[PDB]
């Protein structure tokens, strides 16, 4: 590989995002003119907080991902106080940003971007990995407007430690501290609802209220909801995780990709296709 890089190799700029144990900063590599999104983590804070297992697992999962619908790790290096991860810069930002600005997607865009997410999850789960915190803030759009899914600190590599954003948490989490590939499919059913309705399916004044509706399966479809989308969503937001379309007990991604909502989809070269214009 090329020699290890250093902070001094980069012109740092704009902060792209702030996590709890990391900041992501836009950097341009001097020698190449390339722009990376560099995730910076301070060792003391990680060690103090007992996150070494999470930082490690993050780097490790990201090293194993070789697929266009995922953020790529290009390099890592380290000074005395900090860790740096050279990641793909997603030029167009969060999917949630677009949900906000156009309110919700028409059927073509829902179907295109839903399909990409399904195809991303098929690959991920193929390698025995659970994202565990899938959501519109985690799904970035590169400058071609294809998705790039990020944020793998909280991911789990198959062979129950209490993660998740409230809106997208699956029942089994609230019930057994359990998580499986189907937890991600739950999140999918939530994200789909949100693409169409323009809003997460379970919403309440606070986390506890949210968790209540979730385990009760307490949410409703607006009348304008595309029927074939609604139908698919109903086969994902199933309290029983062994009966969610797309999971191993349901015989996997074949039946999920076969679902009528995806009738017009060509799964085979999704990232070669030209994304429908939003809105
Ligand atoms: O461009 C990026 N590449 C890889 C990761 C990444 C991550 C973020 C981020 C970071 C922290 C909190 C929220 C967010 C979401 O905005 C932004 C841009 C990128």
mmCIF file of C-alpha atoms and ligand atoms in Angstrom:
data_model
loop_
_atom_site.group_PDB
_atom_site.id
_atom_site.type_symbol
_atom_site.label_atom_id
_atom_site.label_comp_id
_atom_site.label_asym_id
_atom_site.label_seq_id
_atom_site.Cartn_x
_atom_site.Cartn_y
_atom_site.Cartn_z
ATOM 1 C CA UNK A 1 0.000 0.000 0.000
ATOM 2 C CA UNK A 2 1.082 3.645 -0.221
ATOM 3 C CA UNK A 3 2.909 4.839 2.905
ATOM 4 C CA UNK A 4 0.627 5.840 5.793
ATOM 5 C CA UNK A 5 -0.875 9.297 5.462
ATOM 6 C CA UNK A 6 -0.788 12.147 7.964
ATOM 7 C CA UNK A 7 -2.999 15.091 8.909
ATOM 8 C CA UNK A 8 -0.467 17.317 7.153
ATOM 9 C CA UNK A 9 -1.306 15.554 3.881
ATOM 10 C CA UNK A 10 -4.710 17.196 3.972
ATOM 11 C CA UNK A 11 -6.384 20.561 3.792
ATOM 12 C CA UNK A 12 -9.179 20.162 6.355
ATOM 13 C CA UNK A 13 -12.350 22.214 6.111
ATOM 14 C CA UNK A 14 -16.096 22.182 6.738
ATOM 15 C CA UNK A 15 -17.448 19.787 9.366
ATOM 16 C CA UNK A 16 -19.763 17.311 7.625
ATOM 17 C CA UNK A 17 -21.208 15.833 10.800
ATOM 18 C CA UNK A 18 -20.836 15.268 14.532
ATOM 19 C CA UNK A 19 -21.409 11.929 16.218
ATOM 20 C CA UNK A 20 -20.974 11.184 19.909
ATOM 21 C CA UNK A 21 -17.413 9.871 19.729
ATOM 22 C CA UNK A 22 -16.466 11.149 16.307
ATOM 23 C CA UNK A 23 -16.545 14.236 14.130
ATOM 24 C CA UNK A 24 -16.530 13.897 10.351
ATOM 25 C CA UNK A 25 -14.562 16.597 8.526
ATOM 26 C CA UNK A 26 -14.266 17.257 4.819
ATOM 27 C CA UNK A 27 -10.612 17.046 3.785
ATOM 28 C CA UNK A 28 -8.854 17.488 0.475
ATOM 29 C CA UNK A 29 -5.701 15.428 -0.008
ATOM 30 C CA UNK A 30 -2.968 17.791 -1.203
ATOM 31 C CA UNK A 31 -1.108 15.405 -3.496
ATOM 32 C CA UNK A 32 -4.146 14.198 -5.454
ATOM 33 C CA UNK A 33 -6.730 16.947 -5.029
ATOM 34 C CA UNK A 34 -9.172 14.215 -3.859
ATOM 35 C CA UNK A 35 -11.867 14.931 -1.267
ATOM 36 C CA UNK A 36 -12.450 12.488 1.554
ATOM 37 C CA UNK A 37 -14.815 12.592 4.511
ATOM 38 C CA UNK A 38 -12.461 11.994 7.426
ATOM 39 C CA UNK A 39 -13.981 10.595 10.615
ATOM 40 C CA UNK A 40 -11.904 11.772 13.553
ATOM 41 C CA UNK A 41 -12.025 9.973 16.904
ATOM 42 C CA UNK A 42 -10.151 11.018 20.038
ATOM 43 C CA UNK A 43 -8.554 8.083 21.818
ATOM 44 C CA UNK A 44 -9.024 9.372 25.382
ATOM 45 C CA UNK A 45 -12.749 9.810 24.896
ATOM 46 C CA UNK A 46 -13.012 6.339 23.342
ATOM 47 C CA UNK A 47 -10.977 4.661 26.081
ATOM 48 C CA UNK A 48 -12.630 6.647 28.830
ATOM 49 C CA UNK A 49 -16.033 5.643 27.446
ATOM 50 C CA UNK A 50 -15.272 1.973 26.783
ATOM 51 C CA UNK A 51 -15.785 2.184 23.027
ATOM 52 C CA UNK A 52 -12.666 0.387 21.807
ATOM 53 C CA UNK A 53 -14.797 -2.640 20.894
ATOM 54 C CA UNK A 54 -17.037 -0.336 18.819
ATOM 55 C CA UNK A 55 -14.368 1.683 17.040
ATOM 56 C CA UNK A 56 -12.580 -1.552 16.251
ATOM 57 C CA UNK A 57 -15.679 -3.315 14.953
ATOM 58 C CA UNK A 58 -16.521 -0.248 12.884
ATOM 59 C CA UNK A 59 -13.153 -0.218 11.102
ATOM 60 C CA UNK A 60 -13.301 -3.970 10.655
ATOM 61 C CA UNK A 61 -16.772 -4.116 9.073
ATOM 62 C CA UNK A 62 -15.924 -1.210 6.785
ATOM 63 C CA UNK A 63 -12.803 -2.991 5.575
ATOM 64 C CA UNK A 64 -14.933 -5.956 4.415
ATOM 65 C CA UNK A 65 -17.505 -3.957 2.441
ATOM 66 C CA UNK A 66 -16.912 -3.887 -1.283
ATOM 67 C CA UNK A 67 -20.137 -2.628 -2.809
ATOM 68 C CA UNK A 68 -21.207 0.624 -4.473
ATOM 69 C CA UNK A 69 -24.097 1.210 -2.036
ATOM 70 C CA UNK A 70 -21.727 1.521 0.903
ATOM 71 C CA UNK A 71 -19.276 4.068 2.237
ATOM 72 C CA UNK A 72 -15.754 2.902 1.461
ATOM 73 C CA UNK A 73 -12.862 3.059 3.907
ATOM 74 C CA UNK A 74 -9.874 4.280 1.909
ATOM 75 C CA UNK A 75 -7.309 4.533 4.714
ATOM 76 C CA UNK A 76 -6.662 5.044 8.398
ATOM 77 C CA UNK A 77 -3.883 6.690 10.334
ATOM 78 C CA UNK A 78 -3.270 8.058 13.786
ATOM 79 C CA UNK A 79 -1.491 10.848 15.606
ATOM 80 C CA UNK A 80 -0.891 10.961 19.363
ATOM 81 C CA UNK A 81 -4.396 11.945 20.410
ATOM 82 C CA UNK A 82 -6.567 11.022 17.404
ATOM 83 C CA UNK A 83 -7.682 8.319 14.946
ATOM 84 C CA UNK A 84 -8.547 9.174 11.345
ATOM 85 C CA UNK A 85 -10.732 7.181 8.930
ATOM 86 C CA UNK A 86 -10.625 8.198 5.270
ATOM 87 C CA UNK A 87 -14.186 7.665 4.045
ATOM 88 C CA UNK A 88 -16.143 8.295 0.821
ATOM 89 C CA UNK A 89 -17.501 11.844 0.731
ATOM 90 C CA UNK A 90 -21.242 11.653 0.044
ATOM 91 C CA UNK A 91 -21.620 14.920 -1.841
ATOM 92 C CA UNK A 92 -25.388 15.261 -1.599
ATOM 93 C CA UNK A 93 -25.829 14.413 2.074
ATOM 94 C CA UNK A 94 -28.652 12.667 3.930
ATOM 95 C CA UNK A 95 -31.686 11.051 2.347
ATOM 96 C CA UNK A 96 -33.710 12.637 5.151
ATOM 97 C CA UNK A 97 -32.721 16.030 3.710
ATOM 98 C CA UNK A 98 -34.614 15.221 0.540
ATOM 99 C CA UNK A 99 -37.554 13.748 2.384
ATOM 100 C CA UNK A 100 -37.758 17.103 4.204
ATOM 101 C CA UNK A 101 -37.549 19.345 1.176
ATOM 102 C CA UNK A 102 -40.002 17.599 -1.158
ATOM 103 C CA UNK A 103 -42.185 16.248 1.632
ATOM 104 C CA UNK A 104 -42.301 12.666 0.353
ATOM 105 C CA UNK A 105 -41.485 10.762 -2.828
ATOM 106 C CA UNK A 106 -43.777 9.814 -5.675
ATOM 107 C CA UNK A 107 -43.979 6.138 -6.558
ATOM 108 C CA UNK A 108 -41.016 6.029 -8.952
ATOM 109 C CA UNK A 109 -38.486 7.475 -6.474
ATOM 110 C CA UNK A 110 -39.783 5.478 -3.521
ATOM 111 C CA UNK A 111 -39.394 2.365 -5.667
ATOM 112 C CA UNK A 112 -35.967 3.255 -7.025
ATOM 113 C CA UNK A 113 -34.421 4.183 -3.694
ATOM 114 C CA UNK A 114 -36.245 1.477 -1.765
ATOM 115 C CA UNK A 115 -34.858 -1.048 -4.229
ATOM 116 C CA UNK A 116 -31.311 0.261 -3.717
ATOM 117 C CA UNK A 117 -31.710 -0.117 0.043
ATOM 118 C CA UNK A 118 -33.045 -3.664 -0.369
ATOM 119 C CA UNK A 119 -30.100 -4.438 -2.646
ATOM 120 C CA UNK A 120 -27.706 -2.888 -0.115
ATOM 121 C CA UNK A 121 -29.186 -4.993 2.690
ATOM 122 C CA UNK A 122 -29.063 -8.155 0.622
ATOM 123 C CA UNK A 123 -25.348 -7.629 0.191
ATOM 124 C CA UNK A 124 -24.769 -6.704 3.798
ATOM 125 C CA UNK A 125 -26.677 -9.628 5.206
ATOM 126 C CA UNK A 126 -24.951 -11.793 2.633
ATOM 127 C CA UNK A 127 -21.735 -11.208 4.572
ATOM 128 C CA UNK A 128 -23.441 -11.953 7.883
ATOM 129 C CA UNK A 129 -23.673 -8.368 9.131
ATOM 130 C CA UNK A 130 -26.462 -6.466 10.886
ATOM 131 C CA UNK A 131 -26.497 -2.684 10.656
ATOM 132 C CA UNK A 132 -28.728 -2.339 13.721
ATOM 133 C CA UNK A 133 -29.340 1.378 13.306
ATOM 134 C CA UNK A 134 -30.577 1.832 9.727
ATOM 135 C CA UNK A 135 -32.303 5.180 9.067
ATOM 136 C CA UNK A 136 -32.524 8.127 6.587
ATOM 137 C CA UNK A 137 -29.718 9.972 8.415
ATOM 138 C CA UNK A 138 -27.492 6.917 7.854
ATOM 139 C CA UNK A 139 -28.341 6.645 4.165
ATOM 140 C CA UNK A 140 -26.287 9.181 2.259
ATOM 141 C CA UNK A 141 -26.520 10.294 -1.358
ATOM 142 C CA UNK A 142 -23.361 10.527 -3.425
ATOM 143 C CA UNK A 143 -23.189 13.200 -6.050
ATOM 144 C CA UNK A 144 -24.784 10.839 -8.572
ATOM 145 C CA UNK A 145 -27.706 10.515 -6.162
ATOM 146 C CA UNK A 146 -27.154 6.837 -5.518
ATOM 147 C CA UNK A 147 -27.232 5.852 -1.840
ATOM 148 C CA UNK A 148 -24.198 5.214 0.291
ATOM 149 C CA UNK A 149 -24.952 3.656 3.652
ATOM 150 C CA UNK A 150 -22.746 4.720 6.499
ATOM 151 C CA UNK A 151 -22.210 4.408 10.260
ATOM 152 C CA UNK A 152 -21.057 0.935 11.244
ATOM 153 C CA UNK A 153 -19.835 1.528 14.761
ATOM 154 C CA UNK A 154 -23.114 0.104 16.057
ATOM 155 C CA UNK A 155 -23.126 -2.718 13.496
ATOM 156 C CA UNK A 156 -22.973 -6.364 14.624
ATOM 157 C CA UNK A 157 -21.090 -9.180 12.869
ATOM 158 C CA UNK A 158 -22.865 -12.553 13.165
ATOM 159 C CA UNK A 159 -20.965 -15.602 14.424
ATOM 160 C CA UNK A 160 -27.782 -7.811 21.841
ATOM 161 C CA UNK A 161 -26.132 -4.755 23.411
ATOM 162 C CA UNK A 162 -28.964 -2.255 23.303
ATOM 163 C CA UNK A 163 -28.559 0.028 20.260
ATOM 164 C CA UNK A 164 -30.985 1.823 17.921
ATOM 165 C CA UNK A 165 -32.744 5.085 17.093
ATOM 166 C CA UNK A 166 -36.162 5.118 18.690
ATOM 167 C CA UNK A 167 -38.371 5.541 15.620
ATOM 168 C CA UNK A 168 -36.761 2.601 13.842
ATOM 169 C CA UNK A 169 -36.222 0.176 16.736
ATOM 170 C CA UNK A 170 -37.745 -3.277 16.201
ATOM 171 C CA UNK A 171 -40.033 -5.023 18.723
ATOM 172 C CA UNK A 172 -37.606 -7.863 19.441
ATOM 173 C CA UNK A 173 -35.147 -5.266 20.694
ATOM 174 C CA UNK A 174 -37.675 -3.908 23.186
ATOM 175 C CA UNK A 175 -38.417 -7.475 24.245
ATOM 176 C CA UNK A 176 -35.284 -9.662 24.326
ATOM 177 C CA UNK A 177 -32.415 -7.236 23.809
ATOM 178 C CA UNK A 178 -32.310 -9.392 20.640
ATOM 179 C CA UNK A 179 -31.319 -8.283 17.134
ATOM 180 C CA UNK A 180 -31.162 -10.063 13.778
ATOM 181 C CA UNK A 181 -31.089 -9.406 10.066
ATOM 182 C CA UNK A 182 -34.828 -8.873 10.440
ATOM 183 C CA UNK A 183 -34.300 -5.880 12.718
ATOM 184 C CA UNK A 184 -32.837 -4.158 9.648
ATOM 185 C CA UNK A 185 -35.902 -5.194 7.627
ATOM 186 C CA UNK A 186 -38.073 -3.655 10.298
ATOM 187 C CA UNK A 187 -36.105 -0.437 9.811
ATOM 188 C CA UNK A 188 -36.663 -0.878 6.078
ATOM 189 C CA UNK A 189 -40.443 -1.086 6.512
ATOM 190 C CA UNK A 190 -40.180 2.128 8.555
ATOM 191 C CA UNK A 191 -38.046 3.942 5.983
ATOM 192 C CA UNK A 192 -40.374 2.941 3.153
ATOM 193 C CA UNK A 193 -43.398 4.218 5.093
ATOM 194 C CA UNK A 194 -41.443 7.424 5.633
ATOM 195 C CA UNK A 195 -40.589 7.819 1.944
ATOM 196 C CA UNK A 196 -44.271 7.644 1.023
ATOM 197 C CA UNK A 197 -45.951 9.284 4.003
ATOM 198 C CA UNK A 198 -43.047 11.658 4.479
ATOM 199 C CA UNK A 199 -42.895 10.770 8.172
ATOM 200 C CA UNK A 200 -41.825 7.848 10.440
ATOM 201 C CA UNK A 201 -44.613 5.322 11.234
ATOM 202 C CA UNK A 202 -44.268 5.372 15.026
ATOM 203 C CA UNK A 203 -44.150 8.857 16.577
ATOM 204 C CA UNK A 204 -44.842 10.103 20.116
ATOM 205 C CA UNK A 205 -43.944 12.746 22.674
ATOM 206 C CA UNK A 206 -41.045 10.717 24.069
ATOM 207 C CA UNK A 207 -39.059 7.507 23.671
ATOM 208 C CA UNK A 208 -41.180 5.486 26.050
ATOM 209 C CA UNK A 209 -44.343 6.489 24.229
ATOM 210 C CA UNK A 210 -42.675 5.529 20.947
ATOM 211 C CA UNK A 211 -41.671 2.140 22.255
ATOM 212 C CA UNK A 212 -45.240 1.596 23.415
ATOM 213 C CA UNK A 213 -46.737 2.070 19.941
ATOM 214 C CA UNK A 214 -44.005 -0.111 18.468
ATOM 215 C CA UNK A 215 -44.640 -3.212 20.575
ATOM 216 C CA UNK A 216 -48.380 -2.627 20.105
ATOM 217 C CA UNK A 217 -47.870 -2.149 16.360
ATOM 218 C CA UNK A 218 -49.739 1.112 16.666
ATOM 219 C CA UNK A 219 -49.581 3.105 13.403
ATOM 220 C CA UNK A 220 -51.814 3.752 10.367
ATOM 221 C CA UNK A 221 -51.500 4.321 6.618
ATOM 222 C CA UNK A 222 -52.643 7.632 5.082
ATOM 223 C CA UNK A 223 -55.275 7.078 2.371
ATOM 224 C CA UNK A 224 -52.991 8.267 -0.428
ATOM 225 C CA UNK A 225 -50.424 5.560 0.334
ATOM 226 C CA UNK A 226 -49.509 3.597 -2.797
ATOM 227 C CA UNK A 227 -51.292 0.259 -2.290
ATOM 228 C CA UNK A 228 -48.455 -2.020 -3.364
ATOM 229 C CA UNK A 229 -46.107 -0.056 -1.118
ATOM 230 C CA UNK A 230 -48.541 -0.239 1.786
ATOM 231 C CA UNK A 231 -48.813 -3.969 1.220
ATOM 232 C CA UNK A 232 -45.053 -4.450 1.287
ATOM 233 C CA UNK A 233 -44.731 -2.334 4.419
ATOM 234 C CA UNK A 234 -47.309 -4.529 6.126
ATOM 235 C CA UNK A 235 -45.140 -7.563 5.392
ATOM 236 C CA UNK A 236 -42.121 -5.926 7.065
ATOM 237 C CA UNK A 237 -43.677 -4.262 10.116
ATOM 238 C CA UNK A 238 -44.617 -7.676 11.472
ATOM 239 C CA UNK A 239 -44.091 -8.062 15.221
ATOM 240 C CA UNK A 240 -42.879 -11.627 14.657
ATOM 241 C CA UNK A 241 -39.386 -11.208 13.237
ATOM 242 C CA UNK A 242 -39.457 -14.700 11.688
ATOM 243 C CA UNK A 243 -42.337 -13.647 9.455
ATOM 244 C CA UNK A 244 -40.850 -10.490 7.928
ATOM 245 C CA UNK A 245 -40.542 -10.607 4.144
ATOM 246 C CA UNK A 246 -36.844 -10.867 3.363
ATOM 247 C CA UNK A 247 -35.679 -12.873 6.366
ATOM 248 C CA UNK A 248 -34.252 -16.394 6.355
ATOM 249 C CA UNK A 249 -37.404 -18.053 7.741
ATOM 250 C CA UNK A 250 -39.322 -16.435 4.878
ATOM 251 C CA UNK A 251 -36.696 -17.871 2.517
ATOM 252 C CA UNK A 252 -34.711 -14.711 2.014
ATOM 253 C CA UNK A 253 -34.383 -11.926 -0.494
ATOM 254 C CA UNK A 254 -35.883 -13.745 -3.444
ATOM 255 C CA UNK A 255 -39.448 -13.362 -2.217
ATOM 256 C CA UNK A 256 -38.751 -9.802 -1.072
ATOM 257 C CA UNK A 257 -37.388 -8.670 -4.439
ATOM 258 C CA UNK A 258 -40.263 -10.548 -6.074
ATOM 259 C CA UNK A 259 -42.871 -8.427 -4.288
ATOM 260 C CA UNK A 260 -45.226 -6.606 -6.743
ATOM 261 C CA UNK A 261 -44.079 -3.142 -5.650
ATOM 262 C CA UNK A 262 -40.766 -3.971 -7.313
ATOM 263 C CA UNK A 263 -42.305 -5.329 -10.489
ATOM 264 C CA UNK A 264 -40.647 -2.781 -12.771
ATOM 265 C CA UNK A 265 -37.288 -2.998 -10.975
ATOM 266 C CA UNK A 266 -34.160 -4.423 -12.610
ATOM 267 C CA UNK A 267 -32.145 -5.462 -9.550
ATOM 268 C CA UNK A 268 -29.184 -6.565 -11.574
ATOM 269 C CA UNK A 269 -27.500 -3.205 -12.299
ATOM 270 C CA UNK A 270 -29.282 -0.726 -10.028
ATOM 271 C CA UNK A 271 -26.183 1.488 -9.612
ATOM 272 C CA UNK A 272 -25.715 1.770 -13.375
ATOM 273 C CA UNK A 273 -29.263 3.133 -13.688
ATOM 274 C CA UNK A 274 -30.007 6.857 -13.596
ATOM 275 C CA UNK A 275 -31.886 7.829 -10.421
ATOM 276 C CA UNK A 276 -35.327 9.353 -10.946
ATOM 277 C CA UNK A 277 -35.374 13.085 -10.309
ATOM 278 C CA UNK A 278 -36.722 14.268 -6.935
ATOM 279 C CA UNK A 279 -39.410 15.287 -6.462
HETATM 280 O O1 LIG B 1 -19.791 12.190 3.489
HETATM 281 C C1 LIG B 1 -19.759 11.358 4.387
HETATM 282 N N1 LIG B 1 -19.117 10.114 4.267
HETATM 283 C C2 LIG B 1 -19.059 9.146 5.257
HETATM 284 C C3 LIG B 1 -19.638 9.329 6.464
HETATM 285 C C4 LIG B 1 -20.351 10.605 6.726
HETATM 286 C C5 LIG B 1 -20.973 10.844 7.980
HETATM 287 C C6 LIG B 1 -21.661 12.070 8.249
HETATM 288 C C7 LIG B 1 -22.300 12.283 9.583
HETATM 289 C C8 LIG B 1 -21.427 12.311 10.739
HETATM 290 C C9 LIG B 1 -21.928 12.505 12.050
HETATM 291 C C10 LIG B 1 -23.317 12.678 12.251
HETATM 292 C C11 LIG B 1 -24.208 12.656 11.147
HETATM 293 C C12 LIG B 1 -23.735 12.459 9.806
HETATM 294 C C13 LIG B 1 -24.793 12.449 8.715
HETATM 295 O O2 LIG B 1 -24.743 13.666 7.988
HETATM 296 C C14 LIG B 1 -21.710 13.065 7.212
HETATM 297 C C15 LIG B 1 -21.100 12.848 5.954
HETATM 298 C C16 LIG B 1 -20.422 11.621 5.707
#
